[model samples]
Target: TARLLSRSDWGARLPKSVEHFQGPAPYVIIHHSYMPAVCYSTPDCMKSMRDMQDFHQLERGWNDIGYSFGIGGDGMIYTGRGFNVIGAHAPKYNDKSVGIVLIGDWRTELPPKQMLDAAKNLIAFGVFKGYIDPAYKLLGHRQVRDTECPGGRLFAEISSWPHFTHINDTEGV
Candidate 1:
């Protein structure tokens, strides 16, 4: 079984349900946190989640942190925006995709081992749990919109993931 670190573990507050959900997640959208780079650690992971949640809820006046899940440098996973809820990360695609934000910008460096492993497991888990379609296309935020979101190196890495694929209406759930 894949390790699951839930919102309760991080003391995240979430509403029971969100009204704007656009139905089942059709894709997995990858992103990289634009935060400053530092030594990637589990403690730092928790702090970033806490801060991002606060920023989204309080400063940005959004309902919650926008991503569905986050993979930290230490391989820790933090629940964000929660599953089955609409995220504000991407304008049009937010409701159709599950946004996963990696802990650091990958423009200059590659993702750490732990982060990559965690991400792979999480994607597989999402597929098995019906949170994501197994055949659903995996894409960086930059692909569907304008902006260098996940970065070039990270984007390249995503393409090589074993599970990456394009889905069609006949694809399995």
Candidate 2:
């Protein structure tokens, strides 16, 4: 099973209230944190999650951390909004997708193999748990929006993986 560290595991503050996702997620949108630095140690990675939550909640004025889940370079899965909550990651697809962000910038480098594996495992778990569709599509942040997100190298890496339907290959769902 894919082990995920709950928000409480990392000392997350409570959100104002929960905002539920509309239905079972049909997409798994991927992202890169784009942090100036990457977190290699467990403590640093946990701190990074806290910092992101702070930014997403305090600075961006969102209800909570934007992503449904986050995978660290240390190969740990950090829960964000989690499960059935409506995430604020993708602009138009938040209610219909589960966003999974890989921690760190990947424009020029690839994430650790462990990070990739954990993300894929998490996706499988999501499907197994019925939170996501069996045929859920994989997408990069840039695919649904006009931005260079999920980074270049990382996007290229996942673009070839199973269920990664190219943005241009199909009409916008």
Candidate 3:
């Protein structure tokens, strides 16, 4: 089972406070942190959240750490920019999507089984919480943008996963 960690449990790094679009979120976008293979513990992942916010604020000249949420290999979910806020993770879809960043770059190697499982569980929970629709679309960062974000192999798997609810029956959100 996936534990729903509070947003406050994550590091204090965030973008310059911006107004979140108070409209319904339409999709879930997946991304890779692009970090190399390393056992990113919960604290380490929190530091990465800080570093990403810094990069967005200082280097790339963006508002904040782009993704709405992130999952580490340690099976911990670190909250990113608020879910309702438009993220810089994707261009056109930023306004309508909640970006979920998986910790490691899949190009170098596949994420651990636990990490992928956490991701899927997160998606399921998001659906249950009414944050996403039962038929809500799941796309890799590459789909709406030009980069191979979640990685090719991972992207392929995302496409292969059955859409719509299959894991449960007689449940609605």
Which candidate leads the pack in TM-score?
A: 2
Cα lDDT for residue 148, candidate 3: 78
Local distance difference test, candidate 2? 0.88
**Which one wins on lDDT?**
2
TM-score of each: 0.85, 0.94, 0.84
TM-score of structure candidate 1: 0.85
lDDT of each: 0.78, 0.88, 0.73
In model 3, the runs with Cα more than 4 Å from the true position are 36-38, 164-173
RMSD of 1: 4.2
Estimate, for each residue in 25-135, the C-alpha lDDT of model 2 and write its tens digit.
Answer: 899999999983567776787899899989989998988989999888778899899988888999988888999999999998999888999999999889999999988
Per-residue lDDT of candidate 3, residues 74-168 (tens digit): 88776777567888888887888779888777854777777788878877777777776667777787767679788876776676765622222
lDDT of model 1 at position 95: 80
Local lDDT at 92 for model 2: 85
lDDT of the structure predicted as candidate 1: 0.78
Winner by TM-score between candidate 3 and candidate 1: 1
Candidate 3 at residue 68, lDDT? 83
